[PDB]
């Protein structure tokens, strides 16, 4: 969509693979504000609303929290302390055509300052002077809707890069969905630390003759001591016993 018509959709109930962006070897505008790229994989926040728009090359720095400009004021303003990341990459091979890319428009002027994270869709014309416009272009109408022209022969400053912005903010809604965590092959018959989904402990792993119904994740036998877990990566039921210890 256009820069002035940026969408807002919620991403939830699925795993978010941020690691595929690191090894893509195609992004040149990988900056994060208020958070580290490495530490946002295991932990995440809700409200995973994604905003998609196209920003020209000479005004990439304009789209940033705490930074003002031309696009950053009357098209899309990022509020302060925006805990998010910006990723942009060139799209000359597909998002361009000869004679000008007459598909993207934007709003250039507006009477009042825009509130953060609101979208206005209207055909209202600018009113710089006291004399109103009666629908006919004059000295004070200045129709803000203009179509940008992108060509394959444009310079690097005018090259339109494909940019996507992911927003992460903490609200009262709990139970957010985050990215994946590393898994390691199970080792058997050894006192080995384990940390499954929600529980952890130390003990020796061995085969189990007991059988589990397919909707339990683990189990305990006596005095809230876990003795059997079933990893969903294998669909196999095991026994856990504390490894050998005692007094000499």
């Amino acid at each position: 969509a256009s820069v002035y018509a940026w969408n807002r959709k919620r991403i939830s109930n699925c795993v978010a693979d941020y690691s595929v962006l690191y090894n893509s070897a195609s992004f040149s505008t990988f900056k994060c504000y208020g958070v580290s790229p490495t530490k946002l994989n295991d932990l995440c926040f809700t409200n995973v609303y994604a905003d998609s728009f196209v920003i020209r090359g000479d005004e990439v720095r304009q789209i940033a929290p705490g930074q003002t400009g031309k696009i950053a004021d009357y098209n899309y303003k990022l509020p302060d302390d925006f805990t998010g990341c910006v990723i942009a990459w060139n799209s000359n091979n597909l998002d361009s055509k000869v004679g000008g890319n007459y598909n993207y428009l934007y709003r250039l002027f507006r009477k009042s300052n825009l509130k953060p994270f609101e979208r206005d869709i209207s055909t209202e014309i600018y009113q710089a002077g006291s004399t109103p416009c009666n629908g006919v272009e004059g000295f004070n109408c200045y129709f803000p809707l203009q179509s940008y022209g992108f060509q394959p022969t444009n310079g690097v400053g005018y090259q339109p890069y494909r940019v996507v912005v992911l927003s992460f903010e903490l609200l009262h809604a709990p139970a957010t969905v985050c990215g994946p965590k590393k898994s390691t092959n199970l080792v058997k018959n050894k006192c080995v630390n384990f940390n499954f989904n929600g529980l952890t402990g130390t003990g020796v792993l061995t085969e189990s003759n007991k059988k589990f119904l397919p909707f339990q994740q683990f189990g305990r036998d006596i005095a809230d001591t876990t003795d059997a877990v079933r990893d969903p990566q294998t669909l196999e039921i095991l026994d856990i016993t504390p490894c050998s210890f005692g007094g000499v």
């Binding site: 004679g99 000008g100 250039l108 002027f109 600018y126 710089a128 002077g129 006291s130 004059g138 000295f139 004070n140 200045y142 129709f143 203009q146 179509s147 940008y148 022209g149 060509q151 394959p152 022969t153 444009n154 310079g155 690097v156 400053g157 005018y158 090259q159």
Partner: protein, 596 residues
């Protein structure tokens, strides 16, 4: 509710609207030059009418804004250029005489004719036919016939046409409340609204004339020196008591005297500075020629070329069927698109032109951050003088030995530099009197204090006095030889070449003092100094956003037109020029001796 916020809204609307239309016109003009096709002629007229009508609409909307209350200077310069009415003042029945006359000039000039009268065998074009007959032959009789082959067969049909042109272009100024059409061309140099920086329009005529009294004694000795080595070849064919013919001064227009060096070489026994044989032993091509030129500029400090030029532009002459013209021109398509349009050859002239046409490109991306109306040079002389300072540095023997064109053991004595410096004197000093005299005649005839019967007797009488040329044949009023030149016929301001020289040497002395070079200006170099590169690019990036009179104060510190830093360039040449002309008759009076 302020005019300042109202002007920024209008220029922001125009900048995005114009760059869409300017890119369509620049892309259309590029395919015309690159490819000649039938439909492409119709295609140019389609894009050019809606582009010309767009400027008509923007000029009417800015007229209702009053100019007596805008204290901001950034939008005042933009509104002054946008409010030039141009052709909108003319009526519909008179404006149709504009597009008709200008297209007739291009088609008439394209007709090549050297067929002999009463003997119509065949005749070819200008490039294979006319250039060989002026650069190689040494016969007086046929060149005299060739002189009458164009001024009596082509200029005879311009006498009713050019006089109609100069009575209606002069009338727009009264309809635009100016004095004359000569004052209209001085509006590019007019600066108003700045305290202490104001440049009056009439002071420029006085200041230009005041600087000419030191150009004249230098040109007196140049004509005296060149007259002793030409009468050696023609003992009884030219008399050594008068002046020289006009059709023996190197080019068709006599602008550059570079072609008389081979005929009038002082000492031809030692070899000249020629490296055409040096590149062919190592098999140099077009790619390796331009690769070392790009790394020369990035060594200075200027930014390198973008990635959308090497794989997109054309460099050599492609194919056999493409007969498109490749006259060397600089292209500014906008939006980061930069191209060079020329046919490469392994020659002396094309190698220097390759450096010359890139300098205008290197000026164009500097003001790329400026708005579209200010995306230009500071004046008409800046964009030409900026493109020539790297030409002075690239012709130095030090820069030629830096790349590796010259031999590693090439001594630099006196005579190896006098040969180079006299080549520069013929292309720089020799063009100063010709630019001032021709522009001085056009300004007063547009002002109007010259009647009809005193055009030719005053034009010829200054050629005998200033230039020093005796007319080989008397000419009556039916001739119209001053209107045959390309610039005068096509409405081009020739004053941008007079201020080009006075600017390209003000910048040269200022930049060489920053690099602390110990020696004269001819041996000075710019490379291997990163302090000078960052200093220049900050002033290059300003463009027209600042006044040009502030650009002078940014380099030399003197607000006036200084004449002292030009003789210091030629002190080694002037002391040598003074000893050979000890006994020769320097300084001509009025001379009716040969053709009384």
């Amino acid at each position: 509710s302020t005019i300042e916020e109202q002007a920024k809204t209008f220029l922001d609307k125009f900048n995005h609207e114009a760059e869409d239309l300017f890119y369509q016109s620049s892309l259309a003009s590029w395919n015309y030059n690159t490819n000649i096709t039938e439909e492409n002629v119709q295609n140019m007229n389609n894009a050019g009418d809606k582009w010309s009508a767009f400027l008509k609409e923007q000029s009417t909307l800015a007229q209702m804004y009053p100019l007596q209350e805008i204290q901001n200077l950034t939008v005042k310069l933009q509104l002054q250029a946008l409010q030039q009415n141009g052709s909108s003042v003319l009526s519909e029945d008179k404006s149709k005489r504009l597009n008709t006359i200008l297209n007739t000039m291009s088609t008439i000039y394209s007709t090549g004719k050297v067929c002999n009268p009463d003997n119509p065998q065949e005749c070819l074009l200008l490039e294979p036919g006319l250039n060989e007959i002026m650069a190689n032959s040494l016969d007086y009789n046929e060149r005299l016939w060739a002189w009458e082959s164009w001024r009596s067969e082509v200029g005879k049909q311009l006498r009713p046409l050019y006089e109609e042109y100069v009575v209606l272009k002069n009338e727009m100024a009264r309809a635009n409340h100016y004095e004359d059409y000569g004052d209209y061309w001085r509006g590019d140099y007019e600066v108003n609204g700045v305290d202490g920086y104001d440049y009056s329009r009439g002071q420029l005529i006085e200041d230009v004339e005041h600087t000419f009294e030191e150009i004249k004694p230098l040109y007196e000795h140049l004509h005296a020196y060149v007259r002793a080595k030409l009468m050696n070849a023609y003992p009884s064919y030219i008399s050594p008591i008068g002046c020289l013919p006009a059709h023996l001064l190197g080019d068709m227009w006599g602008r550059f005297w570079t072609n008389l060096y081979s005929l009038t070489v002082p000492f031809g026994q030692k070899p000249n500075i020629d490296v055409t044989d040096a590149m062919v032993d190592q098999a140099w091509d077009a790619q390796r020629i331009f690769k070392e030129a790009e790394k020369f500029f990035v060594s200075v400090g200027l930014p390198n070329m973008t990635q959308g030029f090497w794989e997109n532009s054309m460099l050599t002459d492609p194919g056999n069927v493409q007969k498109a013209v490749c006259h060397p021109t600089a292209w500014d398509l906008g939006k980061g698109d930069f191209r060079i349009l020329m046919c490469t050859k392994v020659t002396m002239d094309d190698f220097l032109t390759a450096h010359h046409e890139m300098g205008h490109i290197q000026y164009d991306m500097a003001y790329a951050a400026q708005p579209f109306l200010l995306r230009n040079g500071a004046n008409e002389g800046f964009h030409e003088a900026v493109g020539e300072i790297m030409s002075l540095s690239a012709a130095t023997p030090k820069h030629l030995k830096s790349i590796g064109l010259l031999s590693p053991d090439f001594q630099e004595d006196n005579e190896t530099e006098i040969n180079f410096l006299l080549k520069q004197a013929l292309t720089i000093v020799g063009t100063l009197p010709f630019t001032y005299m021709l522009e001085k005649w056009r300004w007063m005839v547009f002002k109007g204090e010259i009647p009809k019967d005193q055009w030719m007797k005053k034009w010829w009488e200054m050629k005998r006095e200033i230039v020093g040329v005796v007319e080989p044949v008397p000419h009556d009023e039916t001739y119209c030889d001053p209107a045959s030149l390309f610039h005068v016929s096509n409405d081009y301001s020739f004053i941008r070449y007079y201020t080009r020289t006075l600017y390209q040497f003000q910048f040269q002395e200022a930049l060489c003092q920053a690099a602390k070079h110990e020696g004269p200006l001819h041996k000075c170099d710019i490379s291997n100094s990163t302090e000078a590169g960052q200093k220049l690019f900050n002033m290059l990036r300003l463009g027209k956003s600042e006044p040009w009179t502030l650009a002078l104060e940014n380099v030399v510190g003197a607000k006036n037109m200084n004449v002292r830093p030009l003789l210091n360039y030629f002190e080694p040449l002037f002391t040598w020029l003074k000893d050979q002309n000890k006994n020769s008759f320097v300084g001509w009076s009025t001379d009716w001796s040969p053709y009384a």
